[PDB]
């Protein structure tokens, strides 16, 4: 059955909803990005309308095989009415076509549902400056002070460098970059320009990639392995037998590998910087872990919450635990008691 805090009272909408079967009242089901745990249970048999930016449903059309039918897709930042209701979809800073989903009930309730997202003071004028949000439905993944990390800007800095010192130093070092969805690409891209090379992969994640409308990708991305020396893998080969295993298959080409394993949050946050970054190695192979994440730092949550002040706060991740249900309401009575709303 289908839980509370993916149902939008006053309407007959459910958001990231797909894995319970047919949702009793639902006349659209709402897709906020295209991320497994969010579409788990869409497939080529789904028979109901379904709402999403374009590059979701590029990749619902092409790597799940719905149907072109049940396939809604609508503009960001426009006014839009479906089933008689006003809504809005706002860029998420997550992963590409993620969206915010803002909802103007009939009776003049406003609704944010963030789905996922990395907040940003850019997102304070955007269509939300322009009134009052009376319910919040909010991405909580890191609503922990712990939970700190560098801005996405000094993690690329940091691995352009990485890589461009170690090719310099020894051209026949292959850099290799794990991957196991969408979202993160910035990685590879800035690495493979500032080596003057395109990023191999399989035939499956070059297809995934040519339904993201990335400005002139096909001068990006390639199949041909062979040409490129950035490579992408599975993130589960990342470790020190895959990428022995990996460096076989290229043929006496190459003599070193550095690999990059994009992470969100781990506790060496909480001691060391970005600049003090060491990578584990074994032989002529090195493995940097990278903390970009695509949610929000507590402190970047705060700061949104608190300039949106909305009467009521929904929570749609760690909701699983009495611990964490309590602990998060704690943050949002500290956050509203310190802003005066
Ligand atoms: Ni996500």
């Not at 909408?13 to 089901?29: I, L």
């Not at 310099?168 to 990685?187: D, F, M, Q, W």
Request: charged share 15%; aromatic share 12%; proline share 5%.
């Amino acid at each position: 059955t289908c839980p509370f805090y993916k149902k939008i009272p006053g309407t007959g909408f459910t958001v990231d909803a797909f894995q319970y079967g047919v949702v009793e009242g639902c006349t659209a089901y709402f897709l906020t990005h295209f991320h497994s745990d969010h579409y788990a249970g869409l497939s080529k048999h789904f028979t109901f309308p379904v709402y999403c930016s374009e590059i979701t449903g590029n990749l619902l059309k092409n790597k799940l095989h719905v149907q072109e039918q049940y396939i809604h897709p609508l503009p960001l930042d426009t006014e839009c009415i479906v089933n008689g209701v006003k809504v809005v979809l706002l860029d998420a800073n997550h992963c590409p076509g993620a969206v915010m989903i803002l909802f103007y009930l009939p009776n003049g309730t406003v609704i944010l549902h963030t789905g996922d997202f990395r907040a940003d003071p850019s997102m304070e004028r955007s269509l939300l400056a322009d009134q009052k949000v009376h319910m919040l439905y909010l991405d909580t993944t890191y609503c922990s002070p712990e939970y700190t990390f560098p801005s996405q800007q000094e993690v690329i800095r940091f691995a352009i460098n990485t890589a461009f010192e170690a090719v310099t130093l020894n051209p026949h070092a292959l850099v290799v970059c794990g991957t196991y969805s969408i979202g993160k690409e910035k990685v590879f891209l800035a690495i493979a320009d500032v080596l003057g090379s395109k990023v191999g992969m399989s035939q499956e994640k070059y297809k995934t990639l040519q339904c993201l409308n990335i400005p002139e990708i096909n001068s990006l991305i390639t199949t041909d392995m062979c040409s490129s020396l950035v490579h992408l893998l599975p993130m589960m080969q990342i470790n020190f037998k895959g990428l022995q295993s990996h460096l076989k298959k290229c043929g006496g080409k190459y003599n070193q590998i550095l690999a990059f394993r994009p992470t969100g949050w781990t506790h060496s946050n909480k001691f060391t910087r970005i600049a003090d970054v060491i990578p584990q190695t074994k032989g002529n192979i090195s493995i940097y872990g990278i903390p970009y994440s695509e949610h929000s730092s507590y402190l970047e949550m705060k700061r949104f919450v608190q300039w949106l002040k909305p009467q009521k706060i929904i929570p749609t991740v760690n909701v699983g635990t009495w611990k964490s249900r309590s602990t998060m309401e704690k943050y949002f009575r500290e956050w509203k008691l310190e802003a005066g709303y």
